[PDB]
Amino acid sequence: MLKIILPSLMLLPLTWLSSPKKTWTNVTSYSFLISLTSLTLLWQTDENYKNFSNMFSSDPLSTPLIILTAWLLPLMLMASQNHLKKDNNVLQKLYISMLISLQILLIMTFSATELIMFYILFEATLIPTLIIITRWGNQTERLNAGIYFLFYTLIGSIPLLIALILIQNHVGTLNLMILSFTTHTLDASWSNNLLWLACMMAFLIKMPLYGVHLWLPKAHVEAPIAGSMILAAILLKLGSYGMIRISIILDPLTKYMAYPFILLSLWGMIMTSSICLRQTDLKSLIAYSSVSHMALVIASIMIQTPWSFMGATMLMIAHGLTSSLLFCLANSNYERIHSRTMIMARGLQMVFPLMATWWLMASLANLALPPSINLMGELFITMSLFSWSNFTIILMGINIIITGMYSMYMIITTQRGKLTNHMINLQPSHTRELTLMALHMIPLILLTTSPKLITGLTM
Amino acid sequence: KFYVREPVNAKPNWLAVGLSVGASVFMWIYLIQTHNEDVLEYKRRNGL
Amino acid sequence: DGPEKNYEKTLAILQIESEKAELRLKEQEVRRLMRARGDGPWYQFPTPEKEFIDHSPKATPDN
Amino acid sequence: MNPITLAIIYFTIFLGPVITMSSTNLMLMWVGLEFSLLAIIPMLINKKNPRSTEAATKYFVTQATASMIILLAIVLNYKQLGTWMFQQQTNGLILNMTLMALSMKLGLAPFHFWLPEVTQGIPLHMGLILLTWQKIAPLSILIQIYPLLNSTIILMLAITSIFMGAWGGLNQTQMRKIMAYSSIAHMGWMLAILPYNPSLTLLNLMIYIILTAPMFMALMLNNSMTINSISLLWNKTPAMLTMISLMLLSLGGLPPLTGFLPKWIIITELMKNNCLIMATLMAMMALLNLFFYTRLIYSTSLTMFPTNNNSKMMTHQTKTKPNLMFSTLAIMSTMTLPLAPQLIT
Amino acid sequence: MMNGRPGHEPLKFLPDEARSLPPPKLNDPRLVYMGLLGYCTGLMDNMLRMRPVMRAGLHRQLLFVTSFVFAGYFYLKRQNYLYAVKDHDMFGYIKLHPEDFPEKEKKTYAEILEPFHPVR
Amino acid sequence: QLLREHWVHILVPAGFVFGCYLDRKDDEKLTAFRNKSMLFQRELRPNEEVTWK
Amino acid sequence: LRYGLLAAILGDKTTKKLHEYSRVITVDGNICSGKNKLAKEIAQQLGMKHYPEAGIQYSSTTTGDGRPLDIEFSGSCSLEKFYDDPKSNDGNSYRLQSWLYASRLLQYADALEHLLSTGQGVVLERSIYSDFVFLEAMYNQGYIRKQCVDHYNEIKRLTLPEYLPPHAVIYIDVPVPEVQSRIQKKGDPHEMKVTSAYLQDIENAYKKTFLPKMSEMCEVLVYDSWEAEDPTKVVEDIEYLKYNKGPWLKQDDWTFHYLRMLVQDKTEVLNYTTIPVYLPEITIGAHQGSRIYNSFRELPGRKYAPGYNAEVGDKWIWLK
Amino acid sequence: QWQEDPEPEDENVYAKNPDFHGYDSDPVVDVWNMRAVFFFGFSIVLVFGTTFVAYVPDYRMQEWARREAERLVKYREVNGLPIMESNYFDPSKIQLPED
């Protein structure tokens, strides 16, 4: 893991020592090489786990998240290097440093073998995205969004720290494999119920669970494009990864303690899909779609079925890719028309045909068109939920119907229809942003071609 | 002469430069010597 | 290098972590026992110094 | 002040806590406290304004009353045991009076009402000298009698100190008052970990000192006493915004800053001693402390408040004010978390 | 808690028993990070004094790195001694009181009956 | 002058080589069960001295 | 800064280096009234350093290369624009007044540092004590507003009592029609567009506030033009002046030391001129402030500390 | 009013550089950034990385598990053994509690 961590660390001196006319080129190229290096974690020819060191290890669950982070860093640089052209050189290098630090800390968080180090890197990732949102956001409400994000996460994560220290005192090491082997069954008392809630509520906050999801739409709206990408594509999945890692020592009382959160997830995905149906802001629509998909992931992890875990992993990877792609397309329209209003730009299919093709493919990925990994994850989550209870199919079907409805509504109101001819400032297309859309869509196609990479721990 | 007033850092403070370089060299040399003596003392105490 | 390298590295890591866990639990028990009944090196609370007591003969013989 | 009286006053300020820490006798520890108070009063009132006069008067009467209660405890112990040290069997009333008087000298809640007011109205360097140097000697006295103290009263004092510090720092806009309520909260943490492990008390004290010193130095760069005054720092000293943000986040206890380490290890020791309720409440109020720190960061660094026209002339002028010891303390208070096993004992 | 141990020299930085310990390797991540912190301190000091960040004050940066490595080495040796004597005292107390630390017999997974909780 | 003006291109490869070296250091650090695993306990071939390096 | 407590202990005593001509003499008058020549001749034949009137570009000429910088760097205020349109809605008048007060404060700090360091006397033209006359003239003509006046008075209260007043204040009394005639003879088209009401407000502010307030603490030397326009009788009066009042009598070595430290720390001098009172005539905003600050930092010789700018010929940077 | 800079208007970048690629204002850095993004992103990552992942063998023991399953099926079918025993563990080595 050190062979990925060290050159990502060396990206920062490269950023601060490169010429201002060469910084973007050098950092983008070497981050692409970093991702190519990170692809060596897929060499898993055995049932064992690649425990590289005493503090770093690789997993069938951790590996796709690490590869996705390393792949998202150059895409974030390409996405963010347009709204920083009228910007100071040291501020540009600081922004690149923030993105690189996010990538480093997220790779270390996913490769961590010890839960206290996982929590330390959790908060370490909490810092620079707050800095990015607050400093390079556009509207006034970025400060309130950053406060909401930071303190939802902190109030979640403090009882997680208390619970981790308690489990460390009880067991001795807080090492993941040691806990997985010497797991003890809890006796289902009120203290154990509170311990369960303490170690689950941080991840449920960052997922986000319904009712506590209020930080996410304003944070994603007010964030810059790279911040929205890293948030919606890695940090929610970081919460899910924490849930999967910590759920192994919570038997058996997760069986009955999972009940309120499954109901919250299902009804919240219905409610947030309805909000997407009636939402006037494109980034808000994408954010609430992310809330619904992560609610599906929450329900799968709560029901703790091998099909549910596999569908959760596939939906994590697929939703990260398609949500970053949707945010990049919305940011292209935002850099064109300087607005986020859903209905303001309408006939963009006429002027931007290839970008309309990218929009259509992103939305078809969003509504889980087969045989994509989006549909793979959603279908296996549905199968596991129907095994858990046959009446969940009603909520699943309503969610699927509204999902297709808001995705096609987005397509029709942003691309189809008559062209808003007053928008004289419609530059044709940037090869940079078309490349960004291609670099989002192609890994979706390749993972659709070979879905065995992102199945996860259970299969 | 560019500046209208002579800067306090127009010329390098040679006493400070010599003292700092000598302190750095002395500390490195003393560090290496005490590390070698610590290695030798550890070997002599543990019979290695 | 092959699967045996990763297998035996995992065995070494697990041995190290299990020994560390057992040592931490033993350290907690040692600290608790010493704090309860201080008889080891740790938690030795102070005591007035014995060497500052007069033992010379004094004015009053009843000392 | 002529250099003769500067040397006398500063040497007595130094000598007070040194005598207190080196003294075996409770009476010599008390006269070290007297030395510290008497020597620090003239430098408090040195600016000779009405606010400085009020601050010096309030500080004098508070520390004098607390020192009289300390002397009462010492004399009662001498009456009971015939010695000049709380050895093992001194009365719990005597020990509680000692704890209460030392907490009033330290300035933790509910004895905290003077500390933001004394910190206001004095110059920034004297606020630094107060909030760092003046707390070492009472903490040394508390550390010397750690197994004798009452955990219930100590925990109550600690939890109300952290609560009132969080709320006061939330309300205040004056930088000196903000730093004083920060001192109250951190003193609450130190007192909370005092009866269980004084090594962690010393660790938290050292971390707080090395975090408080460069924050006060950065305030001393431009005499920024207000949120707005520190907010226009981007025009005056733009190179200090990152270190200001990092030090404020370290004061907030955010990982991976080294200021997360004292709160983390104090929580760990409390969990080892089974005070989970106290640890959780202290952690939530520490989150509130981090909130007012984050609002300060928003004001000074992440946003850019409007500047003045004379700031152009201030940029024309050049400064040599930030000393050599600023950056060392800032780095050691920012990026030292991986050396945590070395920082703890 | 270890200040009251027998044979404790007062205000002694490195007692002679620490000489039995193996010294730090002098190229180890703790001291390398200390030198990195010293270099970062020098760069930050240059930037705050409005000097060129890297090409100014080379003697100052060298002194910062050297002093950080020196102090870190001696402090690291002291902390290694402290942890070593902590483990020594712990093991000695365990050997002195074996009846308070009994060797528990862990049975195999054939005589214990773990309750099975079906997930369905 | 290419070495002077393009010296920044070696930092990331140097970090990669250093990371590979540190991974090798961790591999040779964790050798307490080298050819001692009950799954892979095999007799050494006469031309080799370790099972893996 | 070389001077400090250590240098004071080793011996840098101002009272040791004073003499009979270590005086601060401020020459004051109306807009065009014999003030530049009189101060020049007084300084020349008393062996004192002449400080001309602190203009807009005073800090630019005393820092860096000493060339006059661009106007957006130096205050963003124009005296010619004030003369053309005094009641302009952008707020040029009070911006000019506050900038000129800050420039006079910097010049007074420079003169005090020179006097306390070398012992040579200083002859200033229209120091900080005679700038509120322009402020009150602007206010009574309606050019600025009450909030501007309150902000000026707050800055003057924050800055003025930290220093020592001039030893001698020389005043030139020239009537308003004579000032108007001299302005016409000078021939500046912008300066010709001034009002006799504004000139009379300046003179009334002088006679009603400046002269008695300086009379209670220093020696006042009101002269007409004919007593002036001949800078030898004035010099003879200065020579036979007896300074027996004011706060200069009670000053000793350590008060002089602390004053010298204050006036040599220039950011400490200009600290209260940049109070965060958000008056719209003087507050700027983040975008314009960043643009102006970045342009000033990319100006030659201004990117780093003086002595560290390699583009202007600084050497031995790596050794300092 | 406060002396605030006016709103900057985004100019048509294609007006002065009709071959603009989205990366930088001057054409040379722009075209080299485009070439670097395409070459290091598509050519050597989306092709070589895809080939590497495609030629990772026996990924999580898929084909090994298939071959071992075939071998066990052949053995248990020619020896008359059950294909799967109902108990994974032998009941002889499990000590049940007495009551």
Ligand SMILES: CCCCCCCCCCCCCCCCCC(=O)OC[C@H](COP(=O)([O-])OCC[N+](C)(C)C)OC(=O)CCCCCCCCCCCCCCCCC
């Ligand atoms: C993001 C959501 C935030 C709020 C909900 C957080 C989780 C709620 C449920 C857990 C209780 C609170 C966290 C406790 C963390 C430690 C848990 C643990 O170790 O449990 C076992 C322990 C019990 O210890 P034990 O397990 O050793 O028990 C010993 C048992 N015998 C003797 C049989 C062996 O539980 C506790 O100690 C819990 C005490 C909590 C007291 C303080 C609660 C304060 C309020 C909490 C919420 C504050 C934030 C929100 C405010 C409002 C916002 C709108």
Ligand SMILES: CCCCCCCCCCCCCCCCCC(=O)OC[C@H](COP(=O)(O)OCCN)OC(=O)CCCCCCCCCCCCCCCCC
């Ligand atoms: C792992 C975590 C990843 C996280 C995100 C990473 C992003 C960065 C990615 C960088 C590059 C890494 C690519 C990773 C996927 C590699 C795909 C691949 O080559 O898979 C191998 C596969 C053959 O493998 P095989 O074992 O035969 O498959 C299972 C059968 N037992 O090979 C093939 O089958 C050949 C594939 C290439 C040939 C072209 C295929 C074109 C397919 C067109 C489909 C059209 C319909 C699409 C519909 C979509 C609807 C939305």
Ligand SMILES: Nc1nc2c(ncn2[C@H]2C[C@H](O)[C@@H](COP(=O)(O)OP(=O)(O)OP(=O)(O)O)O2)c(=O)[nH]1
């Ligand atoms: N509004 C305003 N104008 C000022 C201020 N200070 C100086 N001025 C203007 C008045 C004149 O037009 C110009 C030059 O000032 P002087 O009094 O030195 O005039 P000048 O040199 O033309 O004549 P003189 O020195 O009297 O022989 O600067 C001030 O504070 N406010």
Ligand SMILES: [Mg+2]
């Ligand atoms: Mg003139």
